[PDB]
Subunit: 281 residues, 4 copies
């Protein structure tokens, strides 16, 4: 009922790279600082739930920036591999709601007051990803005005073409009928749905043998949006079961404010084309 | 607009108050990723994040299992089962996240595996703590932590205490089951040996579920925990097979074969063994 | 790279009960009849996606009926074990959307034509489940006029207390302040949120040590509702990526009509009590 | 707390194609015929668990046959799209074990005896998939003697090149150093690992810019094999918690005989090349 230690296994790493040194585990595993007094059992779940999410969001931003570089270089297969990993990261972010759903309102009311006004609405990394996918709201910079350095990193992504705008620029380089404004415009203004892209996407979806690279990237972007909307929905269903329709710590109306983001679309013309697409030829 | 306006009442004057980033210590958490490849390797951020998210979930899993043991010691069955239900979800997220790392190819990994030196998850103190708590106590593993005295002392404290499984047997003894007296006090550093005298104890529980509903539900909770842990081991081992094949491990082991030896172990043997003789309820 | 057969393995199955015989697989695996001419590759996925869902809905109704019978008999642990299986069945119904999301609009437009007016709106088993959980709608009976035996089955569940009403009757039996109307009423009417139940759920969630059975079942129902809403949401997102805002085959506006079901609640007082619960 | 019907909704479906009609739900939903007397609550789960699996295996066979046709035609992107769906189908087959794990041994012992010798060892569609992916075993044909039509469909896939063999023939068409034997061989023989393929896969994995199609397909097949092994493992863990180390209804030793299949490989040279690939 025991596995013997194999010969050859290293035990003295004191002058070599260590597992705890590589992964900076003393730093990482001292970052959990529950505030309840006396200690509340459920506050450790609460901290770890958001911290695991912030680590996945860090990786998601790293991958999405690389997907943008690939698109800029017309490196389609490399972009698609990076988007495949991005999808898996968003899947873990969505799946993990099942842990926090074991937190009841009885448990949460034991420590919610220690949070003060702290909220996920104040997540810089979340807002960075929202902006990079295209949901640019300059009103969010004033939310971070109390933190100038974070505000600057959000302004940077605000001023750059989104992942979706980089996709349109890739379609323009391959002779699609992309309007000239996608070559240069005020990137800080959120993309507005453009009916002139309808015939561009109809031609891709209806001639998939010719436009297989474009078609596969369209579907990768619908997959990314769909998974992000599921993250939003599972978060909002968690809020409903934990605080119901109470106002949020961050000062919003709570569920209704979250429902307003579920009504937004990152890649509107990819959804809109469904109403007019015919059979593949 | 397909922009969400900021609601009135949202907190933005946050320079002197607790914020999300403050509460969750995100300056500390998100400075803990220190890739070593020169020049930078794209895939090293995934590699670090994959292990760090796992270590955060293992930290929560130890926190929950300690509480499940306290509840069992106090005969608090419904509370114990609620903590076990969360423990299962945590083990499920640890298992599901293998899907992210399976996007790492051997081509990618060979660009930075040499930076890791002898570092390995085999050297994870929190993983070893969980293995010991569930009852896979191998005193040979203390020498892996010989150069971390505080860590070694933490692993000795869980070595010297009854496992979660031994606490379940002690709970069964308090409710009049035919538990041998050795489970009241024995050398707990010695890993549990499968005990044929427990066979009739488990047969009686599984065949009289209306009388022994509390016991039956806890048996099934433990079988769930074991099965999810074995799934974690299997998915890790399948990931090792697709990334390094049958290469020896950084930690100095044979790799896949050494991992297969742990898959062969059972935490709760009498609960599996009873299946060969149980009849109808 | 070959596993040898062990000697004791039964290889002469002529006249014996076989896997295929027990599971009626001749019957099951002859029930897929694509109508596209010539055959469209993607139509097999389409049929299999809904048929697997309907087998899961068949099991979900079987379990939820058993959960009601346990509640009626105050058999709480049995009820919880049946609700645990029910949650896992709803999890499979929700997860499997990932398969259908590999169907693109230009694939579907190859065969949508063959479906005529056919729609999951006309799923008797889905509606049966919706009714049993408590979203009763007598307007649906007319949809099943074409199938009088099916229609009667839907009317039977319409006329019996829901899962939620059987929960309230269970609370009444253990001295909770459940209004007398839950003892007997016209069950064909969809439950409407009842403010007078707030103090009942406040007491349960604020004294979990005393009311652990009630607390556990409350959380089980919130879990069932949450997973049911995630099914609706994943179905709706699949509709958006396959037909967008096109009208549905069944004659509805499509996404907007589906979004109206997302605003329905099975267990309204369990969600409402979150605004007033105040430390246990 | 009620949604009104919109006026455009079709409510008069007498004589029209309905959901139930299109999906043959009369035929599908009469296919559950439990044998316990009196009826055992858990037998419905038992039948539905295998019947949902058999519907997914029917789609999986349908998709993989299409993946082979695309490979035969050098249609790499279409192949990859069908393998992506195949992966999702294998994920549902693996995830659904979580339902059957709510079956305890004292429930199953209430009706196991009604099954007689019936076993998933006798799943034609499972064996068809196993053979198509490359784990050929002529000893299985005798199991299906009772079903002459089924046996012949299983002998056909036995005698056809595997998905893996079709991949190697694809690599041979694009100038990779694939031995001549993969042009015509006795296909009823299971593929043994071939050390002459190591340099072929080293070149693909070490030059991914040049061999991006091949590399992408290599990873698709490693994905399919990994997900298939996870189905085997989850089934084997379910057997352990339901019957433990009892002999199987099908007459095998049970868990140990299942564990032997976990050591089988569909695409051995794809795993073997991990020990020699460089940066
Ligand atoms: C008990 C669990 C939770 C509750 C009750 C909750 C509640 C809320 C509420 C009420 C809001 C709106 C802003 C406000 O007024 O505070 C919000 C926003 C948000 N929450 Fe949570 N949340 C929960 C868990 C989480 C977790 C675990 C994360 C993980 C990072 C998260 C991330 C966010 C994000 C990013 C936003 C901004 C969404 C947007 O602007 O559209 N929340 N949450
Ligand atoms: C590229 C991915 C991975 C490879 C190739 C790999 C390889 C290995 C190898 C070869 C071993 C045996 C010890 C050794 O010789 O080093 C091992 C053990 C281990 N690995 Fe990993 N691993 C991977 C990812 C992970 C991740 C992400 C974690 C998460 C913390 C992890 C946790 C562990 C643990 C806890 C053990 C000890 C298992 C036991 O003692 O039974 N590994 N791994
Ligand atoms: C290509 C995939 C699908 C599309 C485009 C689609 C579209 C729709 C639409 C438009 C409706 C509204 C009724 C109507 O006008 O027809 C609907 C309702 C429904 N669909 Fe689907 N559907 C899809 C797949 C599925 C699948 C696989 C199921 C599996 C059972 C399903 C089950 C239902 C159910 C139960 C309803 C009624 C929901 C309610 O009344 O609130 N659908 N679907
Ligand atoms: C209560 C649950 C289950 C038990 C106890 C069980 C047990 C067994 C056993 C003992 C065998 C070995 C052959 C024999 O001696 O009968 C086997 C093989 C098999 N079972 Fe199951 N099984 C279960 C559920 C399932 C389900 C739900 C499926 C769904 C398709 C399935 C598919 C198979 C297949 C395909 C094999 C052949 C595997 C191979 O040849 O390597 N089983 N099962
Ligand atoms: N988007 C799905 C299906 C898919 C795979 N390859 C594609 C190529 C084109 C269109 C869709 C796809 C996926 O990535 O799994
Ligand atoms: N073990 C499964 C099924 C289950 C639920 N309640 C139970 C009570 C007794 C035995 C098994 C169970 C679970 O925890 O979901
Ligand atoms: N509802 C969750 C958490 C839970 C488990 N047991 C409980 C008892 C009481 C309240 C909640 C729970 C579940 O079923 O896993
Ligand atoms: N095999 C993984 C990762 C992947 C995506 N695209 C690739 C291209 C080449 C190599 C691997 C990949 C997948 O299909 O998601
Ligand atoms: N997930 C968090 C992480 C850190 C700090 C707070 C939260 C919250 O969930 C608070 C939530 N906005 C609330 O209204 O209760
Ligand atoms: N997950 C890790 C985290 C930290 C340091 C190393 C690893 C490894 O996976 C190394 C592995 N044992 C190897 O043999 O390649
Ligand atoms: N899932 C089905 C099963 C059977 C028959 C139709 C469907 C549909 O999805 C049709 C859909 N209502 C449509 O608007 O295209
Ligand atoms: N899943 C099945 C479907 C149909 C008929 C039998 C089974 C079994 O699981 C029997 C199993 N081989 C046993 O040993 O109990
Ligand atoms: C969310 N806070
Ligand atoms: C849905 N039809
Ligand atoms: C397998 N029966």
């Amino acid at each position: 009922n025991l596995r013997d230690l194999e010969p050859g296994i290293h035990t003295d790493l004191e002058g070599r790279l260590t597992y705890g040194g590589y992964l900076r585990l003393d730093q990482l595993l001292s970052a959990q600082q529950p505030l309840s007094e006396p200690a509340h059992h459920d506050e450790m779940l609460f901290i770890i739930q958001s911290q695991t999410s912030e680590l996945w969001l860090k990786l998601l931003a790293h991958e999405l920036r690389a997907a943008i570089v690939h698109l800029q270089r017309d490196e389609v297969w490399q972009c698609r591999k990076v988007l495949a990993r991005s999808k898996q990261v968003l899947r873990q972010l969505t799946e993990q709601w099942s842990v926090l759903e074991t937190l009841t309102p009885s448990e949460y009311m034991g420590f919610r007051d220690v949070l003060g006004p702290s909220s996920g609405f104040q997540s810089l990394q979340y807002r960075y990803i929202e902006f990079l996918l295209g949901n640019k709201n300059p009103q969010m910079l004033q939310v971070f005005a109390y933190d100038p350095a974070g505000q600057a990193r959000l302004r940077e992504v605000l001023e750059a073409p989104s992942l979706y705008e980089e996709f349109l620029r890739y379609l323009a380089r391959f002779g699609h009928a992309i309007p000239q404004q996608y070559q240069a415009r005020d990137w800080t203004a959120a993309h507005v749905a453009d009916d002139t892209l309808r015939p561009v996407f109809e031609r891709i979806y209806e001639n998939t043998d010719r436009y297989w690279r474009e078609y596969s990237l369209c579907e990768d972007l619908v997959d990314v949006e769909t998974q992000f909307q599921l993250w939003r929905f599972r978060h909002m269903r968690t809020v409903m079961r934990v605080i119901g329709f109470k106002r949020g710590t961050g000062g919003s109306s709570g569920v209704g404010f979250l429902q307003q983001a579920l009504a937004l679309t990152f890649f509107p013309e990819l959804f809109d084309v469904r109403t007019s697409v015919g059979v593949d030829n």
